[PDB]
Symmetry: C5
C-alpha cells in the first residue's frame, strides 16, 4: 500500500501535480518497460521507413500508415477500460473489506470470558489465537507474501499460531479441501466449553461470541471465494486485446511520413510521437490500474500489507484479551462533571474553526410571515 | 471456473499479455466459430466482387460499400455493451454470493447441539445433512451439471443426501411447487425437538440456529429467484441486434474496393480486413462475456463448479459437526504467553517487508509550531 | 416473466442468435407498431419527395434533408438511455427483491409455535394467513393483475385470506390510508397471545417471530413506496424527448435524395433506410426495456408473476406450518455414518467433472527455495 | 410526488408518448422560463444580424458564428451530466429510504407493551408519540413544507406531538445543537420504566424495542446528515458551467447565416433553430432532473410529500398501538382447513394467468439418456 | 462543509445559476491559480508567435499548432474523469457514513445502565466518554484539523476526554500500532463490571450494549482503513496525466494563427481563447472535485467539520446519559386520546397541501367490468 492521504488533505495549487513526482506505486514504475518496448517498435519502423525502404516501398508504407491511422479509435477502448477497471477497483475495495480482523471478537472476549486466573487467561488467549490462526491459514492460501512467510504448516507452528498438539489434530482431519475453517470450529467448541464451565456467565454472551465468530469466519471464506473466482478470463482478454489493437493501429498510423509527399495531415515530422506516447501512457496505465489491483494480495507496491496486518492483529488481540482484561482505572469524576454543557478547548491553530455557525438544519432561515404561521 | 489469480499476483511486464496464451475459458474458445463465420461471409463477398460481378455491378457494389461504411458507428454499441455486460457481471457475482454454504450452520451446530453419544451425533449430522439436501435440491433445479448428476430424486436418495423414509415424506407432500425448502422446515422441527430434549441447552442457542438456518434457506431461495427471473429478454435482444447491425455494416462497408477507382479512403487493398477482424474479436468477445456469465450454472469453463462445492460442503460440514465435536486439544500456554508484546518471525524471502514503517495515521507528520499547540 | 435461463446455460455458437427467434417478451412484440409508424412516416415523406413535390420544392426538400441529418447525433441519446435504463433495471430488480415471501416466517412458526392439537394448528395457520393477507393487500394495491383478481375486499374474504369477522374488524378501523399493515399488527398481537399461553415456549422465540414479521412487513411497505415514488417524471420525459428528437432528425435526414443532384454522401438510393430502421429498432427497443420494467407489476410478458407467487406462497406456508409440523422421519444413521470422509457418486455424464484439481488457494504452486523458507 | 405508475403498468404503443402530455412535475413546467430566455437571446442575436449590422459587421459575425459552432461539443457535457445526475438520483432514493417510519416500532409496541387499562394505553401511545415527535423535529429541520407547517416549537405543542410539560423539559435542556434526538432518549427511558413495572414482560422484548428505536433514530439522523452534507458545491458548479458553456457556444454557433454567402453547411435558413431548441430542452431538462431532486424536501411537484407522511404515520401508529391492541378476532378454522392443498379462485379477467406452467427450475427439461444417468 | 441545501429546495428559474455566485467551496477558489497559470502560458506563447518569431519560425509554429490541435481529444479524458471522480465521490460519502456517532450508544446507555446515585452517573458518563475518546483518537489520527486541535495525548487529557490515570494505563500498554481501540476494550470491561454489579439489569441489555459498541468501534476502524488505503496512486496519476496531456495539446493547438495565412478553421483571431478557457475550467474543476474530496478530513471548505462533530457528540451524549437519565415528564393523556382518528392542523401557508388525494396504490382506478370480477 502506498499511502499518500496526508499529501492530498487539501486541494492545493500543486494538487495532484506533486503526485507525479512519486516513484513507489507509480505509473512510471509499472509501465516504463512497456513504454520502452512501444517506443522501440515505433522507432524501428521509423528508421526502416527513413533509411531502408526504397521509394516504392516508401509509398506503400505511407499508404499503409494512412489506412492504419483510421482504426485508432480511442472511444471504444476508453469505454471498455472504464467499465472493466471500475469493476476491478470496486472488487479491490470489497476484497480489502473482507480481510478478517479480530477487533470485534477481542472486545467481546474481553467482556464475556472471565477470570483473572491462568485458566481465564488461557481461554481468552486461545480463543483469540484460534481467530488469528484461521486468518493466517486463509491468508497463506491467498497471499503470496504470507505464503512466503509461512510456506508450510510447520512454519505456522513455529510462529506459535498453532500448537504441536493442535497440529496433530489438524493433520489427522481427513479432508482434501482447505482447512482454514478448522480453528473456527475449535473456537466454537471452546466457547461452548467455557459457557459450560461458567467462564462465560450467560447464554446471551455465548450467542454474541458465536455471532462475531461467524462474522470473522465469513470474512475468511470471502477471501477464499475472491481468490478462487477470478475476474472472468474472457473479460480480461477482451480488454487486453482492445488495448493492444489500438496500440497496433497507433504504432503504424502515427508514423511520421515524409512531408514532401504532401499527404493531408502529414506535414510536420517531429520524429518523436509525443502525444501518441502520452496517449499510450494514459491508456496502458489505466489498464495497469487493473493489472496491479486484480490480485491485491501480491507483492505490488499498492498490494495490501498482509503480514503487517497479521502482526498487528495478533499483538492487539492478545493485548486486549490478556493485559487489558478487567484492568480499568478507578471510576472518577470527569472534567465536565459539574458542567451542564461541555466543550473541549481549541488550540490557536484551530480556534478559527469556531465562530462558524452550528448548523441546525436547512429550514431555519425561511422567516415566514405572521399570517402564514397561524394554524387553520 | 478458470482461476488465474496466481498468474496476476503482481503487475509484470508480460502482465496480461501472458493471459492471451490461455485456451480454457478463453475468448478464442468462445468465439473462433463466430470469427470463422464472419470471415467466411466477408471473403465470400470479396470473392464475388473480385471475380463474379460485372463492371457495372462492381460500381454499384462500391457505391453500396461506401454507403454501408457510414453506419458502422461503434460508439452506440460500445455504450449498450458496457451497460449490459456490467449488469450481467454484477448479477454473476451476486449469484455466486447466493450459493448456500453450511459453514455458519456447522460452526453453530458444533457449538450448540450437544452429546458425544450416538443420539447427539445423529442430531448434528442430520441437521447438517438437511442443510446439504436443501442445497442439492435447489442446485439440481438451477444447475445443469448438478441436474445431470442428480437427474431424479432417486439419485439424491442413493447419494445419501435423503433417506428412504425422508423420501416417502417428501413425495407425500402435496405441492406443485419446487420443494427445495422442505429440508429447511425439517431442520427447524428437528432443532426445536433437540431443544425440547435439552440437546440444545438454551433458548438463545436455538434462536441462533434458526437465524443461521434462515440465512441459508434465503440463499437457496435467491438461487431460485435468479434462475426464474432472467435478465429481461428484450434487453438481451436489443444488445444482440445492435452488435449484429454493426457487424452487418462492417461486413459490407469494410470490403476492400479496387484502388484504381480512386475512391476517397479506398486506396490500399490488404485483402484481409485485419483491424475489422480485431474489432469483431473485441466487440463479439465483449458480448461473449455476457453470454458465458448470463447463466453461471451451466457447463462453460468459467461457470461455477457446483458439484465440487456440493462435495466440499457435505464433507466439511460432516467433519465439523461429527469428528470435530468437543475434540479440542488441551488448553496450553501459547508461545507468547510471557511476552508483553508479540510478533511471529519472518522468513528470509519476507524480512524485507519489515523496516517499512508501521502506519499510525496520515496526520502524524504535520509537525506544528509551539505557539500553535496551546489551548485557547 | 419470460424465463430463458435454460437456453443460455452455455455460451454456444448460436448463443444469443437463437434468442432473436423468440416472440413472447420480445423486442418485436413490444415495438412492431412503433416500427410500422416510423416506416409509414418515412415512406410518406419519400413518396411526397418522389412523386408530389415540384423541382424547386424538391431542391428545398434536399436542402432540409441535408440540414436535418446533421442533428442525428446518437452519442447523447446513447448516454441518456444508458444511464436511465440502467437506473430502471436496477430499480426493477430491487422491486422484485421487495416481494414479501413467507419462507422465513414459516420456518420460524413451524419451529416455535407448538401443539399438535387443533389450537396449535389454528395458531400456526392463522399467523401464516395474516402474513399472506398482508401480502395480498399490498399486491392488490400495486399490481394490476392482482387487483383484477381481488377487485374488492369481498373477493379477499371469499378467497379465504380474510375471515368475515376479520373483515368486520378491518372495515371498522377508521383510517384513510392503505390498511395493508393491519394483519401484521394482528400477527404481533396473536404471537404475544401465543407466548402468554405458552404455545411459544420462550421469549427468544417470540423475539425471533417479531423480527421476521418486521422483515416481511418492511418488504410490503417497500412495495408501497416503489409504487408511490415513481421514477421522476421529468427524467422519463427527458429521455423520451431525446429519443424522439433523434428519430425526427432521422425521419428527415435519412431520406434518400435523387442521386442525380450529386450531393455529397447521397449517391445511392436504396428506397428503404435499412440501417436507420435497425438503429430505430436498437434505440427504441433500448427505451422499451425501461417502458416494460418501469412498472414490473403490470401485465407485460416480462412483468412479475404476482398471482402465481400468491398461490405458491399461501400453499407452501400452509403446508410447512400445518402438515409438516413436528412430522420428522425417525433419526437414522446416514449413508456416510461410518465414513471418515464422504463424497456422493457422480453419473456417467458428470464424472468428467472429477479429476479437475480441488482448488486449495492461489499460493500453493510458488515452490520457493530452501534458503528462502528459513525464519529470521 | 407525481405518481404515474398506473400509467406505465404495461409497455403500450403510446407508451411514454402519453407522458409528454403531463404538466405537473413536467419538464415543461420546470424549463419553459429558461427556454424562453434562450430563445429570446437567440432571436435578439438573429435580429441584430439580420437588420442592424453593416455588411462588414455581418461578415465578422458570420466568422464568429463559424468559430463558435466548433465548441458545441455535446459529448463532454453528456458525460458530466450522466455521472452527476445519476449521483443525484441515487442520493434522492437513499434520502427517501431514510424517511423515519413508525411501522416496525408500532408492531413491536403493540406486541410487547401490555395492559388494556389506561396506563397501558398511555405507555403505548406515548412511546409511539415520541417516535412521531422525533420525526417531526427532524423533518421541520430539513423540510421547507414541514417547517412552514411547524415554524416554531409552539406549533408542535399545539399539534399535540409534544406536551406542555415535555416542552418545558425540552427547552430546559442546555444544548446548541438540534434536539431532534431528545424524544428518542425519552423513548428509551420510558421503555426501561415499562420493563421495570412489568408492562414489558421480558428482557428480550425490551431489547427488541430498543433495537427498533435505534433503527428509527438512525433514519432521523441520516436525514440530518443528508441535509447538512450537500452534494459538493464544486461539482454542481462544474456541471452548471459545462452546460452553460455548451449553450453559449450554441447561442452563437447555431445562428442562421445568410445562405448567399455560401458558407459550408450554412445553406438553409429556417429562422428558428428547431433542433438546437430540442437539444436545449434535452440537456437543460436533464440538469433540471438534478435541480428538482438535489433537495427532495422542498415544494417541487416531485419533492416528497412530507406532511402527508407525518399525518399518515401518526394516525396509523396510534391506531395500531391503541385501537388494535389485543383486539383479535376469535381464532377460527380457515377456508382451506380441510384441504391438503390450497389455491384461491381466479376472476374471469385473470383466469388466463392460469395454464401458464408453474416454473420448477431451468434444469427440468434436459431429458438426458439412460446410460448418462447411472452413478459411477 | 458548504451547505447550500436551503438554496436548492426548489428547482427555480435562477436554479443553479445562483450557485455560480458563491465563493466558499467554489470552483473559482479552487482553480483560479491554475487558470492564471494556464492563461499565462497561453499568452506567453501567443506573444512569442506575434512579436518574437521570424516568418519561417512563424510558419513552423503554425504547422505545430495545426498538428497539436489534432490530439485535443476530450472524449477519453471525459471518460476517465467520469469514472475516477465518481469513484472518489462515492468513497467520500462512504467515509462520511463511517464517522463514529454516539447516538445509538447513548440511547442504549440511558436505557440500560441504571441508578440516579453518583455511581450510576459515573458509569453512564464514563461509558459515553470512552466512546468519545475512541472517536477522538482515531480522528486525530486521520483529520488534520483534529490533530491540530489535539497534537499530543496530553491535549486529549487536558480536554478531559482521557483522565490522568487512564493516560498512565494507555501509555503503559506496549504496542507499536494505533491505540484508538483501547477505550472500546475499556468500554467492554466497564459494561461487564456494571452487569456484574447489577447496574445493568439483564444479560440482553449487556448484549445490546456490546453490539452497539462494536458498531461504533467498527466505524472507527473504517476511518483508519480509509485513511490507510488511499485511492490507488497509479489511478490518480493516470487521470492527472490524461488531463495535463489534453491541456498541453490545447495550449499549443488553440493558439490563434494569423488569419492571413488562410489555414482551414483559422480565420478569426479573438486573441483570447474563451471556449478553451471554459473547457479548462470545466475539466480542471471536474478533477478538482476529486482533489478536494479525495481526503475529506483536511481543511478544504467542503472537508468534513470534524471538530464541530466532536464537540456536538460529546455534549449530546453527556446530556442524554446524565441530565436526561430517568427524567421523563409524567405520563399524561395526549391531545388525540379521545379521537379515533387524528391529524395535526395545517398552517395557512401549507393547507394547500391538503386536498391532494391520499395515495392508496396505483391500482385503485382501473374500474373493471361486472362480468370480469366474478370468481371462476
Ligand atoms: C485470429 C485470432 C483468433 C485465433 C483463434 C484461436 C486459434 C488458436 C487455437 C488454439 C487451439 C488450442 C487447442 C487446445 O485446446 O489446447 C488445450 C491446451 C490447454 O489449454 P490451457 O493451458 O489454457 O488450460 O492448450 C494449451 O496448453 C495452451 C494453448 C495455447 C493457446 C494459443 C492460442 C492463442 C493464440 C492467439 C493469439 C492471438 C493474436 C496474438
Ligand atoms: C423488421 C424486424 C422486425 C420484425 C417484426 C416482427 C415480425 C415477426 C412477427 C412474428 C409474429 C409471431 C406471432 C406469434 O405470436 O407467435 C407466437 C409463437 C409463440 O412465441 P414464443 O415461442 O416466443 O413463446 O411464436 C413462436 O412460436 C415462434 C415465433 C418466431 C418469431 C419470429 C419473428 C422474429 C424474426 C425477426 C428477425 C429479425 C431480423 C433477423
Ligand atoms: C416547445 C416545447 C415546450 C413547450 C412549453 C410548454 C407549453 C405548454 C404549456 C401548458 C400550460 C398548462 C397549464 C396548466 O397548468 O395545466 C394544468 C393541467 C393539469 O396538469 P396535469 O394533468 O399534468 O396534472 O393541465 C392539464 O390538465 C393537461 C395539460 C396538457 C399539457 C400540454 C403541454 C405539453 C405539450 C408540449 C408538447 C411538446 C412537443 C410535442
Ligand atoms: Ca497485485
Ligand atoms: Ca454459463
Ligand atoms: Ca410492466
Ligand atoms: Ca426539490
Ligand atoms: Ca480535502
Ligand atoms: Cl438476541
Amino acid at each position: 500500500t502506498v499511502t499518500y492521504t496526508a499529501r492530498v488533505a487539501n486541494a492545493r495549487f500543486g494538487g495532484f501535480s506533486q503526485l507525479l513526482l512519486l516513484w513507489r506505486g507509480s505509473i512510471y514504475k509499472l509501465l516504463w518497460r512497456e513504454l520502452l518496448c512501444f517506443l522501440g517498435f515505433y522507432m524501428a519502423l521509423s528508421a526502416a521507413y527513413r533509411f531502408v525502404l526504397t521509394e516504392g516501398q516508401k509509398r506503400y508504407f505511407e499508404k499503409l500508415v494512412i489506412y492504419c491511422d483510421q482504426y485508432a479509435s480511442l472511444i471504444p477502448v476508453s469505454f471498455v477500460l472504464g467499465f472493466y477497471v471500475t469493476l476491478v477497483v470496486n472488487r479491490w475495495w470489497s476484497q480489502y473489506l473482507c480481510m478478517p480482523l479480530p477487533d470485534a471478537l477481542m472486545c467481546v472476549v474481553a467482556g464475556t470470558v472471565h477470570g483473572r486466573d491462568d485458566r481465564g487467561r488461557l481461554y481468552r488467549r486461545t480463543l483469540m489465537r484460534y481467530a488469528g490462526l484461521s486468518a493466517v491459514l486463509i491468508l497463506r492460501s491467498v497471499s503470496t507474501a504470507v505464503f512466503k512467510r509461512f510456506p508450510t504448516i510447520d512454519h505456522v507452528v513455529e510462529a506459535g499460531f498453532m500448537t504441536r498438539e493442535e497440529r496433530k489434530k489438524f493433520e489427522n482431519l481427513n479432508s482434501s479441501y482447505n482447512k482454514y475453517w478448522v480453528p473456527c470450529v475449535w473456537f466454537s467448541n471452546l466457547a461452548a466449553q467455557a459457557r459450560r464451565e461458567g467462564r462465560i456467565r450467560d447464554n446471551s454472551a455465548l450467542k454474541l461470541l458465536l455471532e462475531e465468530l461467524n462474522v470473522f469466519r465469513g470474512k475468511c471464506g470471502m477471501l477464499f471465494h475472491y481468490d478462487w473466482i477470478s475476474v472472468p478470463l474472457v473479460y480480461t482478454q477482451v480488454v487486453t486485446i482492445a488495448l493492444y489493437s489500438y496500440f497496433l493501429a497507433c504504432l503504424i498510423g502515427r508514423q511520421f511520413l515524409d512531408p514532401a509527399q504532401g499527404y493531408k495531415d502529414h506535414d510536420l515530422d517531429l520524429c518523436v510521437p509525443i502525444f501518441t506516447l502520452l496517449q499510450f501512457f494514459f491508456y496502458a496505465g489505466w489498464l495497469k490500474v487493473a493489472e496491479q489491483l486484480i490480485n491485491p494480495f501480491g507483492e505490488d507496491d499498492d498490494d495490501f500489507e498482509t503480514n503487517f496486518l497479521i502482526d498487528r492483529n495478533f499483538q492487539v488481540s492478545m493485548l486486549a484479551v490478556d493485559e487489558m482484561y478487567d484492568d480499568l482505572a478507578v471510576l472518577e469524576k470527569d472534567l465536565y462533571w459539574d458542567a451542564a454543557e461541555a466543550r473541549a478547548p481549541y488550540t490557536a491553530a484551530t480556534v478559527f474553526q469556531l465562530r462558524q455557525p452550528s448548523f441546525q438544519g436547512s429550514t431555519f432561515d425561511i422567516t415566514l410571515a405572521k399570517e402564514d404561521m397561524q394554524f387553520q
